[PDB]
Amino acid sequence: MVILGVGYFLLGLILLYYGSDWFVLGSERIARHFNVSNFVIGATVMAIGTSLPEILTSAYASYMHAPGISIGNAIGSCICNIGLVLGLSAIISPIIVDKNLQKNILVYLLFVIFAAVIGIDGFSWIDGVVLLILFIIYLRWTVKNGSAKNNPSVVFSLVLLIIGLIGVLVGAELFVDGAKKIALALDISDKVIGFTLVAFGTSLPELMVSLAAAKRNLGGMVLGNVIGSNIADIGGALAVGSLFMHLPAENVQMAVLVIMSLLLYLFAKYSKIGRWQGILFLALYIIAIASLR
Ligand SMILES: CCCCCCCCCCCCCCC
Ligand SMILES: [Ca+2]
Ligand SMILES: [Ca+2]
């Protein structure tokens, strides 16, 4: 059943490509409907929508007594979002960050640092409750200072968003399943090849969404999506995972994330996020995947 593997694989790519653009366009219209910035809609609605892969992966794994998976995938996603995802987007469409989104990015940095320190001895279920509460606070705070019948322009906008989200989520796991069915039918099936495949699959929505937005010069949406997804990975995916079981410490990975997060802030505050910032991010991500576990 080789053909099948390819069928799933390319169909998932079809759903990811077209699904992401619909999701982006639908989110862009919604942002204009609720009079909020593209950053806000990306850091909230879009981020939560694309991080639900991680959240379900994390909870299930830790419940099945594999807490290393929950935290590895959570942190690995964050590193990927800044290194790979934001890296490609910054090059495609350079961003000059307004001084009110710089405040949001600084808050993100503080959140990451707070997570890193309390995770030095691993993440307990109490650590998770705390991170989850901060997650909630971030969302409301991001919405508040980003704000202020049955319209066919609104209905069509929500259809674009939802169908788009379904597209990138179904397509992402058709990608993974399609890849796993090929690797099994070619007898090249490792099980570290399956973990990193599934792990990468959960980051596929963010990748395709942020690339689609970058293609339409929506730099705010991309930046918001990256910041929001990372927070949803830590305050959401990692947090829920800690509820079922103590997540062992990943101090080397956290340090990598803090450094990248710090770089992200300094660039947004005192410079820009363009070509050479993106090249640096991609370099760091490539170094990471070449030397980390
Ligand atoms: C919004 C949902 C919040 C769910 C919080 C669940 C906390 C579960 C804690 C379980 C602790 C078990 C301790 C055993 C010693
Ligand atoms: Ca994701
Ligand atoms: Ca702890």
UniProtKB/Swiss-Prot annotation:
Q: Which GO terms describe its cellular component?
A: plasma membrane
Query: What transmembrane ranges does the database entry give?
Result: 3-23, 39-59, 77-97, 106-126, 128-148, 156-176, 192-212, 220-240, 247-267
Q: How does it sit in the membrane?
A: Multi-pass membrane protein
**GO BP of this protein:** calcium ion transmembrane transport; intracellular calcium ion homeostasis
Question: What is its subcellular localisation?
Answer: Cell membrane
Superkingdom, natural source: Archaea
- Gene3D superfamilies according to UniProt: NCX, central ion-binding region (1.20.1420.30)
GO molecular function ontology, one term from the record: calcium channel activity
Chief place of localization: membrane
InterPro entries (UniProt xref): K/Na/Ca-exchanger (IPR004481), NaCa_Exmemb (IPR004837), NCX_ion-bd_dom_sf (IPR044880)
Keywords assigned: Cell membrane, Membrane, Transmembrane, Transmembrane helix
Q: Which Pfam families match?
A: Na_Ca_ex
Q: Can you tell me which family this protein belongs to?
A: Belongs to the Ca(2+):cation antiporter (CaCA) (TC 2.A.19) family.
The name this protein carries in UniProt is: Uncharacterized membrane protein MJ0091
- The species this protein belongs to is Methanocaldococcus jannaschii (strain ATCC 43067 / DSM 2661 / JAL-1 / JCM 10045 / NBRC 100440)
